[PDB]
């Protein structure tokens, strides 16, 4: 039976173990044990905690006293108790008699000697002292040495870890020392917990008032530093006197940090406080989170984990460095585990009451300490800066800490030219740590979740730890490979984008415009004689100008941060450590600037390590340029290349004079990417040997409608496979145009039949009308939403008879659904099968769980306020999540098998990026793995899995029999031959 107050006391004792304040824990424990009503609140874990403390300090007398309080509780000593006793005897070098009596008393209590080294939380110093104690009586006691790590024996992952085969794992372009220095820069950056970036907004304008404002803010910040230090020490004295009594308080938690770090943290939160205010509770959660985080940082700093991580990482870099070899070629995870690995652990977070109490304590202290005058131009009256307002934030009323308007105007006049980012928000300056477990990877000091469960859902992670380790190896390797991709900022593209950004902007090219370009209302109000309607007209006009101004401010700030990060990384090589969501798709961890971003974000990024073009590098760059322009989507590859050779002059002109030339790149679909590609091709053709030109630009190969490709592969649908380029074809097949044609022939049939709706739709059935619907069907579009999309595609035509929206949209959604029922019969059968299966499974009161063909467990988190499952989001969300897990598996297989060939691989879910020299290889792997994925009985393994998982509980037999009936009703596959995918040119193009 755990209790809140018991949690507070236990956290107090453990925190006292952290602060080495043993007399404090002994005082509180003795006072609590001495009282009748307080002795009942104590637990064996607390006595074992103080016991372990005196064991670490070598206090035999105090440990015997604690043992007396254990037997007088009267509880019984367990594994941790005997571990503490043995540790104290070993550290104090006791005689072998007391240790022997300890082993015989332990044998009489029934405890095992190995269960102590397996079930007790002891550091390597504690383990070493306990081992030294056991070796005095039992010198031939050895822990089981486990060295070999098992290799994944999955069907699809067998060849990745099998030693049979010539591996050519790629190495970075950087030497060993340079990589070690990058590790030092990233380690320093994460130890600082803050990153300062120069703001790319406006140039060097010192001004007059800004200097005085900055001076005033500096003086006020020093005064607040002194006040916060004094109030912090006084608060520590008060909480210490509260510990002098038999009550728990947050004194040792305040004794966890260097105080100056606390004051700097509070001043940082005060500087970053928004002008409108924040929820007091959320502020408390932020202060507690940062306090705990900096506590973890200092703890790793002082416990030697950072130094051991240096010795580990520097030897890990031998595999990635260019001027270093390894004994045997292997994957990064394999070499990392072969080096040590200690892995260590992270301090388990405090209970929620401790966090809230500490956060509110620090916030209120910040309110009491910070003061300022009336400002302006010192003042006779002096007031605080932060105030409680008790306003309404989100429906429920909540207390909001609000800054004084003088402080807001002071910060706005100061115009601080620097921006602050979190260490985890910016790309890592060195290769990330390889993923070895769902709890250790990505950043070196900050922990990173393996799955992107929103808001700490806790559900998925335990199921990630439950499966055998090898089952995850595949994913754990893929996420490492994406992370080890070295990126760099394209200086030309950044210079142009900044030149546009700092002046007037260009929203046509995805460059947000400053508030100076916001639409102004012409002219100012002229009330009130006339007219009462003009007041509301100008009211709505002002509302529109304020709306446009606000949205422009949003894009301006977002692009300000993204472009500032790009500028800070201009002369640096950085890495993007990757992560997963609950379904399995990969995402970079730095969210601001990454290759999953917009057009501008992509153009700023290029591979840090280059690659010689070779025989077809330049040609693939030209095809890639035509693809980025989007001008030859329907044409085959040969006509794309010939088109590039045609507009070669406009390519070179666009590369030479981007903003002053013909501006041919500005007309492309992806303008900035086309511009960078134009620069790459321009440099390539002007070299003496184009075949040797080293290219850094990533080439994309994307799967057209990847979801329909995986559905058609699951159902072996012939027509559908032909539609999404699964069958080999000389020209790329458009599924949207085909659906439009099928709906057209249905329209002619119903037009001859006598239907009024089909007669008015003559000559209006186009691709754009059904594009959004057909595209969004894979995500669960129903007849209603598809009807709304068709409505949205019928109202803007203007050349269409009046409204007639109901008949045309209803008939058109029925004909699109029917057309997809003919082209994708097996697809709709599988979607309905998964939908019904999730309906029954979630109707039985259990969330939907499954396993990907690579061994990754996926769970859906949809619940309703244990918490009952939200069956609606389960049944509607199961199919799309399953398809997404499939394309994630395909992408990961492509990544691993490309790594076996030494290629640089990055991915945007279904867009596979590599060097121009290796595109032909990637497309050969991309198809191969795809054919190898759907060749396995995915639907059969899923059905049998759900039968063994949910049709096994003998409680209800009705739902076990109907559910076993539907799960075993797997739809029969079609006639399509999957091998044809290996010869499809436009499957990924």
């Amino acid at each position: 039976q755990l209790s809140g107050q018991q949690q507070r006391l236990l956290a107090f004792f453990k925190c006292c173990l952290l602060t080495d304040q043993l007399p404090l824990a002994h005082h509180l424990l003795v006072v609590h044990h001495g009282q009748r009503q307080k002795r009942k609140l104590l637990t064996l874990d607390m006595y074992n905690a103080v016991m372990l403390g005196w064991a670490r300090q070598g206090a035999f007398k105090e440990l015997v006293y604690v043992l007396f309080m254990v037997k007088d509780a009267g509880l019984t000593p367990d594994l941790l108790s005997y571990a503490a006793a043995l540790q104290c005897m070993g550290r104090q070098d006791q005689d072998a008699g007391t240790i022997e009596r300890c082993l015989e008393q332990m044998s009489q209590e029934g405890l095992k000697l190995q269960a102590l080294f397996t079930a007790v939380l002891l550091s390597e110093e504690d383990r070493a002292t306990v081992l030294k104690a056991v070796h005095k009586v039992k010198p031939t006691f050895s822990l089981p040495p486990q060295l070999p790590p098992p290799v994944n024996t999955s069907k699809l992952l067998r060849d990745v870890y099998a030693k049979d085969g010539r591996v050519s794992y790629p190495k970075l372009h950087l030497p060993l020392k340079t990589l070690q220095c990058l590790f030092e820069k990233q380690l320093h950056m994460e130890l600082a917990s803050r990153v300062c970036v120069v703001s790319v907004e406006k140039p060097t304008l010192p001004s007059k008032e800004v200097k005085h404002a900055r001076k005033t803010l500096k003086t006020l910040r020093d005064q607040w530093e002194k006040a916060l230090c004094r109030a912090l020490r006084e608060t520590k004295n008060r909480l210490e006197r509260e510990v002098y009594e038999g009550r728990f308080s947050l004194y040792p938690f305040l004794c966890l940090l260097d105080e100056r770090e606390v004051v700097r943290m509070l001043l940082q939160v005060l500087q970053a406080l928004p002008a409108q205010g924040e929820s007091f509770t959320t502020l408390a959660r932020e202060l507690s989170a940062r306090t705990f985080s900096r506590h973890v940082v200092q703890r790793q700093r002082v416990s030697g984990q950072v130094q051991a991580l240096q010795n580990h990482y520097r030897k890990y870099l031998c595999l990635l460095a260019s001027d270093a070899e390894v004994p045997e070629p292997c994957l990064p995870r394999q070499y990392w585990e072969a080096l040590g690995a200690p892995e260590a652990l992270r301090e388990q977070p405090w209970p929620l009451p401790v966090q809230m109490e500490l956060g509110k304590l620090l916030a209120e202290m910040l309110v009491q300490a910070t003061q300022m005058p009336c400002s302006l131009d010192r003042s006779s009256r002096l007031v605080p800066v932060l105030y409680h307002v008790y306003s309404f934030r989100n429906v429920q009323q909540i207390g909001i800490l609000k800054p004084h308007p003088a402080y807001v105007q002071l910060l706005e006049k100061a115009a601080e030219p620097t921006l602050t980012f979190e260490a985890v928000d910016v790309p890592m300056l060195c290769p990330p740590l390889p993923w070895t477990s769902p709890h250790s990877g990505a950043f070196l000091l900050s922990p990173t979740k393996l799955m992107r469960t929103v808001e700490g859902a806790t559900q998925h992670q335990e199921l990630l730890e439950t499966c055998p380790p090898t089952a995850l190896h595949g994913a754990l390797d893929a996420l490492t490979q994406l992370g080890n991709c070295a990126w760099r900022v394209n200086g030309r593209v950044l210079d142009l984008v900044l030149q546009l950004f700092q002046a007037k902007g260009c929203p046509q090219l995805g460059v947000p415009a400053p508030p100076s370009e916001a639409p102004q209302p012409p002219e100012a109000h002229l009330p009130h004689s006339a007219a009462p309607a003009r007041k509301a007209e100008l009211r709505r006009e002002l509302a529109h100008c304020q709306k446009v101004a606000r949205e422009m401010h949003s894009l301006r700030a977002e692009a300000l941060y993204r472009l500032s990060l790009a500028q800070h990384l201009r002369d640096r090589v950085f890495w993007l450590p990757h992560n997963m969501d609950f379904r399995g798709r990969t995402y970079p961890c730095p969210p601001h600037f990454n290759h999953l971003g917009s057009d501008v974000a992509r153009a700023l990024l290029e591979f840090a390590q280059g690659r010689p073009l070779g025989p077809h590098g330049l040609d693939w760059l030209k095809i890639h340029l035509v693809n980025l322009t989007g001008l030859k989507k329907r044409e085959p590859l040969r006509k794309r290349l010939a088109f590039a050779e045609e507009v070669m002059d406009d390519i070179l002109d666009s590369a030479d004079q981007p903003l002053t030339g013909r501006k041919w790149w500005m007309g492309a679909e992806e303008p900035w990417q086309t511009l960078a590609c134009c620069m790459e091709v321009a440099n390539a053709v002007r070299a003496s040997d184009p075949a040797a030109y080293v290219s850094h630009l990533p080439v994309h190969q994307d799967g057209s409608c990847n979801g329909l490709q995986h559905y058609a592969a699951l159902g072996r649908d012939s027509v559908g496979a032909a539609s999404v380029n699964l069958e080999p074809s000389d020209v790329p097949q458009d599924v949207y145009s085909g659906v439009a044609a099928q709906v057209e022939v249905f329209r002619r049939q119903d037009a001859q039949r006598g239907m009024r709706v089909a007669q008015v739709l003559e000559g209006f059935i186009t691709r754009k009308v059904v594009k959004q619907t057909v595209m969004t069907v894979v995500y669960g579009v129903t007849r209603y939403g598809g009807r709304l999309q068709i409505e949205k595609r019928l109202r803007e035509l203007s050349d269409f008879p009046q409204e007639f929206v109901w008949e045309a949209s209803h008939y058109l959604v029925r004909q699109v659904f029917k057309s997809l029922q003919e082209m994708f019969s097996g697809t709709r059968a599988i979607q309905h099968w998964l939908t019904e299966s999730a309906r029954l499974i979630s109707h039985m009161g259990s969330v939907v769980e499954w396993v990907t063909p690579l061994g990754v467990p996926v769970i859906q988190p949809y619940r309703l306020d244990s918490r009952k499952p939200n069956t609606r989001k389960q049944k509607n969300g199961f199919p799309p999540n399953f398809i997404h897990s499939l394309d994630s598996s395909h992408m990961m297989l492509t990544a691993l098998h490309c790594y076996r060939k030494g290629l640089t691989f990055v991915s945007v879910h279904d867009c596979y990026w590599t060097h121009a020299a290796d595109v032909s290889v990637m497309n050969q792997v991309c198809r191969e793995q795809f054919v190898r994925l759907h060749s396995e009985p995915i639907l059969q393994d899923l059905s049998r899995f759900l039968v063994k998982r949910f049709c096994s509980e003998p409680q209800k037999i009705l739902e076990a029999s109907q559910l076993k009936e539907t799960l075993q009703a797997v739809p029969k596959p079609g006639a399509f031959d999957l091998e044809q995918v290996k010869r499809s040119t436009y499957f990924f193009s």
Partner: protein, 212 residues
């Protein structure tokens, strides 16, 4: 002039003679989870001061019958008074996201107008009033920009000061001041701004409307 400001603050309009002839008032402030009132006489003596915390209102449903039950049980604990002053918030029929609050308050303000006006059916004299909250904030100088600040510090000063001889602004009975102080200290860790703003509203009502 003064009458116009007295018309921005008090609604509905009450005769100034009858308003200045009050012997005791009850100042009521209600939120989404609590309601608090304070009974003060013309001698600025806090005859009573309490709140009915933890109710079954809000929480997604707006049942008029449950509102009648809760409000009736709440007014069953209130003594008789010459005038009942409520809090008039600055909520408007705009801000569509927070309309649930503006409805709730109105329901409260509706039934409180109907249940406390015990003699209105015969004489048509209002005994329930609406006092502007922002003006109460301006009176105590608790305004910062366009947002009212917490009046907790002013209540704490009124409660824990022994000097301040002559014009303490408020008086606490000896048989009840212990309960008031223990109540304040028991609610110091929680945000109970209705409890404070009710007493502040009573004092402001007496200083602005009764003893001008």
């Amino acid at each position: 002039p003064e009458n116009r400001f007295l018309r921005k603050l008090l609604k509905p309009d009450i005769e100034r003679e009858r308003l200045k002839a009050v012997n005791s008032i009850i100042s009521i402030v209600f939120g989404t989870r609590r309601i608090a009132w304070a009974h003060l006489d013309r001698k600025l003596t806090v005859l009573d001061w309490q709140q009915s915390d933890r109710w079954s209102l809000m929480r997604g449903i707006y049942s008029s019958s449950v509102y009648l039950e809760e409000i009736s049980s709440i007014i069953s604990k209130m003594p008789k008074a010459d005038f009942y002053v409520l809090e008039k918030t600055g909520l408007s029929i705009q801000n569509s996201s927070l309309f649930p609050i503006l409805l709730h308050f109105h329901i409260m303000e509706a039934m409180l107008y109907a249940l406390l006006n015990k003699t209105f059916a015969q004489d048509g004299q209002h005994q329930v009033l609406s006092m502007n909250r922002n003006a109460v904030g301006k009176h105590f100088e608790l305004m910062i920009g366009d947002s009212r600040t917490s009046g907790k510090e002013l209540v704490k000063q009124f409660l824990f000061d022994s000097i301040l001889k002559a014009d303490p602004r408020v008086f606490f009975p000896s048989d009840k001041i212990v309960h008031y102080r223990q109540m304040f200290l028991s609610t110091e860790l929680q945000r109970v701004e209705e409890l404070y703003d009710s007493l502040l509203q009573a004092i402001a009502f007496y200083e602005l409307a009764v003893f001008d």
